[PDB]
Amino acid sequence: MEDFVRQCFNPMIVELAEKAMKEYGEDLKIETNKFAAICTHLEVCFMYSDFHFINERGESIIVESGDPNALLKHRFEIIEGRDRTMAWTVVNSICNTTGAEKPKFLPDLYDYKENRFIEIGVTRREVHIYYLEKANKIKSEKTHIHIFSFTGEEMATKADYTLDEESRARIKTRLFTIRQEMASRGLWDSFRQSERGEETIEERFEITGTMRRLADQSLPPNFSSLENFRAYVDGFEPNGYIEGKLSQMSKEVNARIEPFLKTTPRPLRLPDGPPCSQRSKFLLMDALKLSIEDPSHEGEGIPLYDAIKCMRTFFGWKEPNVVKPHEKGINPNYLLAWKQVLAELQDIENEEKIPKTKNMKKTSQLKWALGENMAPEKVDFDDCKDVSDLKQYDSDEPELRSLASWIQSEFNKACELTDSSWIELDEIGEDVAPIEHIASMRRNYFTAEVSHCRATEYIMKGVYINTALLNASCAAMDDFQLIPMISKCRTKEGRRKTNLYGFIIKGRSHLRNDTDVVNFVSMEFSLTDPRLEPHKWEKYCVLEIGDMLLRSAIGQVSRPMFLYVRTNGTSKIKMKWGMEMRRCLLQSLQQIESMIEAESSVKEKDMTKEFFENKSETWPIGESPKGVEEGSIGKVCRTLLAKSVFNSLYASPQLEGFSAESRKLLLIVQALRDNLEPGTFDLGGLYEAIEECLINDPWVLLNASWFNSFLTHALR
Amino acid sequence: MDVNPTLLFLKVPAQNAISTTFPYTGDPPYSHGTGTGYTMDTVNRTHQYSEKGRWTTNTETGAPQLNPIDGPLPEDNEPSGYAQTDCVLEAMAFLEESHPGIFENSCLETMEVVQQTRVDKLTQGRQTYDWTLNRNQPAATALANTIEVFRSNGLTANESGRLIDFLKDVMESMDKEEMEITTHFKKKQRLNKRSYLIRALTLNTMTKDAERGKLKRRAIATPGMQIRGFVYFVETLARSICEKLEQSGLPVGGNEKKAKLANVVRKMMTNSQDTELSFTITGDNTKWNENQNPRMFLAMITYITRNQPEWFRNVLSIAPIMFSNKMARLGKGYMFESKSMKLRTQIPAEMLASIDLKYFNDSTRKKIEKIRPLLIDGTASLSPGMMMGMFNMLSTVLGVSILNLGQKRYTKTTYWWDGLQSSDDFALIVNAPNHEGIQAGVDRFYRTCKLLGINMSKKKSYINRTGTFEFTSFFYRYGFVANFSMELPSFGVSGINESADMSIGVTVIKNNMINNDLGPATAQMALQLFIKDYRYTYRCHRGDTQIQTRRSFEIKKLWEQTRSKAGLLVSDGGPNLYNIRNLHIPEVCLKWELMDEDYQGRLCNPLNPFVSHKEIESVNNAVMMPAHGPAKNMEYDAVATTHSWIPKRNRSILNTSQRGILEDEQMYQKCCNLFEKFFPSSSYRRPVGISSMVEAMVSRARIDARIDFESGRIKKEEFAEIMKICSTIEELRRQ
Amino acid sequence: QVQLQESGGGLVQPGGSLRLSCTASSAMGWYRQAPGKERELVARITNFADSVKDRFTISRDATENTVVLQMNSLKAEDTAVYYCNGLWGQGTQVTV
Amino acid sequence: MERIKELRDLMSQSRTREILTKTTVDHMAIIKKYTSGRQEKNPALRMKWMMAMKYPITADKRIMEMIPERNEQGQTLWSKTNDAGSDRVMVSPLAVTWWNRNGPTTSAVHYPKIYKTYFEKVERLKHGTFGPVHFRNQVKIRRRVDINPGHADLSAKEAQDVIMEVVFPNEVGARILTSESQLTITKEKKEELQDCKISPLMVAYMLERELVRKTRFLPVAGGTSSVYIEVLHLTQGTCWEQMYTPGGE
RNA sequence: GGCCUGCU
RNA sequence: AGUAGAAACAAGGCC
């Protein structure tokens, strides 16, 4: 039958009908009479629509061939011959522009004169039944319907026929051409009734070929095919198989509970080796401040001018000389770098306006100090294979180092009060609710407690230094840059003040990965002689740069004044995390506020004021040789703030591992102290897990010592 | 006196101050170089936990595979992957018996979803291993490349737009003699059957960064695109199953987890009378993923899909069949340094099979020596067990089956147990009349776990009396206690854009106040610090200050120009009006009545060249990877302002041989923008159909010109011009 | 490196007092030279010539880098040009 | 006119012609998401790192013809170098602030009508009345509650057709909404937003947010009302309760 | 010496 | 040298 559509109809219509065939997903080889019927429907749609044009009037202009002009409007514009999505697109667009009603089924054409749709259907059966059939299929329709049938008859409601009658003679001539051409073909044994509305399909997902063999190799050891295994599974029913293997399984497979008593836990062993060194990016306990007493705010001002003005406030400069060498570098380079920094600072002082940011010369001194041109050149393996020295990067456990007493004192003095306010908080919306007033009062109390704390000063120092370093690295990637360490505080009298700890020289910072390292050299003034705790300054070079006179009742001290100079490095991640050190304030004060709220849930009243003023209640916050010492809530605030600050400063994988594996043991010990009969399956394994995190970090070793002290004081 | 914060625990219980034990204020550990060492170590460890299995050689991939299932029962407490098929089938049968109709229903909804799912659902995924280029690429890019290759090779069933048809094409590709791929350096290369099989069965290995809570780094894996559809269907089934199990806690959030934990502890302890003792085990499973054999997941799913259409069973079984034969790419490689000659070199991992061992240290030398037998075409066969939690939900199903297997109806003894399982972590409440009963119950639970290939970490687990325990960093002490140290890293600028960062910060403060019991004063301090960091990050200072920045001049002139300066946004250098009462209001709407009409109009102008919206999914959704958890998405309330710009892209593609991808990106985006202008609903609802672009665009041009004349700007001259231009593009597409 | 500016010289009666100062912008001091005589040390900062002990007092402010010389009980023999040193000033006349 | 003209210009060049011809409508989404840009793992680090560069943001090409290349002192506002995989050009953040002080102005009166949810929140809070804070232990129990206070009793899909018919009336397709509540919602949001020119996508997104019901599990103590849950952070705490009555009541 | 890139 | 820690940075590539 398909030979007929090969022969007669034009290409355009046959591929339109083929795409309509693909539309609903049925195959053309099984039933083709539908293809012919609907392609004839589509053909009558065209032949009825084309050759029919309109101009600004009604009364369509009919031309056998559209002449070249703007007057190519089509009388009837076709609906079908398009995908369902576009057919409904045209339906909705016509409804929204023509203000007509939206039909629920697919029309075939639209006309302007009568501003409505045409649903053309030419069926094998006579018209006077198919018409009202499709009419009762369509609900309350104003779209006019018109149908032909092979006998040659026409019909329509309203007795309406919308265009010329010679066109309809055309239609029925086409119709009988179709008819008495099948006459030569002979199809009416099924042509009248060949489609009955079949819609059914079964989804087929068949495993075959290579993928089947893979299925045959992904079974238990004693199975040969997926078919057999699935049959076995379907036939499988529970018949007490877990019990049999449990009985047969060796009894050494057990989870015996070892009781956890007061005498069970042993102190954590600390590693032994050379004392632990300093790792901070700046001096914490041995910092010195040169000040100007200016009225500018933290960010307000220009760095270089402030630094120069602060440094001019000090008199007593001496020619620098080596006091304590780096022990691994070239100290003369550090000396020359310091003198170069001074010289270029003067050079800025001379000229017209202090630059906002200064670049330094790339001398051999800072070329060595900043580690320039030291990365091995990257080459290909095929060119370097016979080199005996060629091997992997050194990948082994870090060097072992024992704890020293300097970190303990540094933390002790990091929780001490100061003679300045190191936090100038921002603005918030004016409090409107009583709860907001309570929150503001609490916040004011904590700010009064923690602002005068060395932890806040360290927070500001780190934030400013890391912000400046990151910005300089991102801006001046190539050229070495000078950045004075600046921090602005407020005195007890209320006068604002600036403080200059020293200088940082940032080097080449072409940082691609988050782990890539930018090297800088840090110089900081101090008065602490490095000849008393040399092991804490393994990586520092310390010079003697001047003498300071601070008013004291013992005449006047006239102390020496040294310069701690070192080469340090950071990374994008480290800079970003060090510039978010202000969340240590959060951590600490959230803990304290949780304490206050928990206690106030007992007594139905806010308990902040008496906690902060009466200072009757105290918490164990340290141990003295006499015994455990307790301090007021403010001291707890400062201690927790210092702990968070040191966590942010000495952060490392060792800290995370020890924190987790020691929190586990802390929970076990707490369960013991709560009389909850705690038990363990392998306590030695937990101890070994904790002890492997303690390698060389001073902070984690101090935490381990604190944990041992807590165990000793606990378990009683 | 020496200060010691830990001594604070002598007065404050450990859980009431547990936040102090979370050093989440410093930089988390990161990996620096290759992850090849970790990948090799994981492969060797997975293969040696199942050493007593039986060896075979796949006839298709030619790789050695180790099957430990039904192997000898363990005789020691060391990790073992010798799961027994009959035991696990019985466990699943008991799970079904205790929850009748679970499998049949879940299979019904899964069948509905599979037969109505679309291909585009695969684009909604993070990095995936594209085999066309042998590298990780965004899910959409890899899917597009694979579809292009399939269409070039003759597999065009995916044009039906159905994921099931895409999987049919994927499987049909397995039986092809020779496929063709494209490489740029364009060159057409031919892949034989075995090479393509291994490229479709392989995984890409990387090192996990920003992982807090352990000293050593780990390795993670990413699968290809051929196997992700089957994984999607299997995980849909597993999620539908677990949603019907109250003992599971994987498909829920954190608060639901806490609620279920409280309910189970109350149920276990309350029902226990005075005579019965109760004990809670806070258990962690050692080597959870390395001991879960994909064959056992195949067994579980084929038991689940019993009495179901065979096509459903086949499509759900394809995934574990491929995992059982999965291969893993070793990784980036190894970098060597020579200090004598002062140079460095980078050898790819694919050379580990043949490269001499003189360059490697003792540990790496032994690892390579042990893993070499499993090396096939630069990748190692990893049949014995899963790599990194790809089947999280099925593992949770197995754990829930174990938990339910002790409902006192199967124990047949006075002791019994229950609890909650979330993959790699569990809380087990066991009750028994005497300490001997508790010991026997825990021993039998451990033994049954060892029969299913699941191991309990004795070093990271402990048992106490009920009332105090831990679960996924949630510490329960007669009621869950807030931590607030897990969410600390999320208190900074997110890094999306100005308005997005502001809204996300305020919303995070609000949420942590609601859930994590953040205090009022602490919340105010957090708001102040966040505002300070926000102003210092975006160079948007109050405007009345003299802080010179790269943006302080325009901000200051805008400040001096504005009359009601209280309406200026913090992004434009205005005062901050936020407070505890205003944390749930966008900044634009909070300052709407205070803005001057000129500034208000300039700010919220639709014609601004900065705002760009791509799809309904990416309107106000921000992907923030939370600390100590999987990547998560958040809805943030924000008004589309001129500050909603999107930041610069990487721009490093220009120096790579894969430079033509940018031209293809530009052309695809131009075509997509044209289509959207032709089809405005393209973004909100993704268009569907089987036609091509130009057909729809030209035909809609026809119709829209028509109707927009029937009322609108068009004129006959223009309408006819459009009609004949449509004809022109038609004849152009002809040729 | 340092520049030295003297002030406070002039004309004074026998038994009178006069105050010199030196603004400097190690040791600093005052020297004097009388007509036809060599330049002699007066005081430095302390150390003092025997001729001026109990009569002349030197002090130093390090903050402002200033070295005052208070001269009391002046005599005709103290008539000289007085020079600051740290480097030399220009010299300031003192006539008793 | 224009649209078909850039269509013809695209089809003029062979590569785009092939892309338009061979690519089917269904693959629309795929190729639209086809990109070499990886999703950032650490957005904060790079946002703090990119903002230190010049020209850190991106904007459409049209910015080159509305904003001058430099400001009064000569600080550059935009660059002509396009982004990696787009025709957009990289520009400095000042071009934002500049746009807010001398850029074109419009009538933003209809934004309150569009962003109905946020302005309703503001109005509800502005007329709220606070009360005394009572300090007592709060038994926070976890419950499933609806957060959206303006949901019109419609699901996502249920209101998606309404949203399309309100914004994209022609792409609705087969669906014609039956429920009369949807009829009235369509009428109201059609006549209200008849000429709003913000964007079809944002209008659809905000209509989805407003009409679609959404639910989440939260620890609550009292309240349980939709209006009382949006301020759950302000009314309920660990040991304090703040009586509050939104402006709506 | 000149120019390109900074998660590809 | 320095940062850092089971492998890396201490710029890369292209002419």
Residue numbers in the entry:
A (entry chain A): 1 to 716
B (entry chain B): 1 to 185, 207 to 756
C (entry chain F): 1 to 25, 32 to 51, 57 to 97, 109 to 118
D (entry chain C): 1 to 249
Sentences from the paper on this structure:
The PA C-terminal domain is the binding site for eight nanobodies which cluster into four groups (sites 4a–d) across the surface of the domain.
Central to the replication cycle of influenza viruses is the viral RNA-dependent RNA polymerase which transcribes and replicates the viral RNA genome. The influenza virus RNA-dependent RNA polymerase is a heterotrimeric multifunctional machine composed of polymerase basic 1 (PB1), polymerase basic 2 (PB2) and polymerase acidic (PA) subunits, that catalyzes both primer-independent replication (vRNA to complementary RNA (cRNA) and cRNA to vRNA synthesis) and primer-dependent transcription (vRNA to mRNA synthesis) in the nucleus of infected cells. PB1 houses the polymerase active site, whereas PB2 and PA contain, respectively, cap-binding and endonuclease domains required for transcription initiation by cap-snatching. High-resolution structures of the complete viral polymerase from a number of human, avian and bat influenza A viruses, as well as influenza B, C, and D viruses have been determined. These structures have revealed that the polymerase is a highly flexible macromolecule that can assume a variety of distinct conformations, enabling the polymerase to perform both transcription and replication that require different initiation and termination mechanisms.
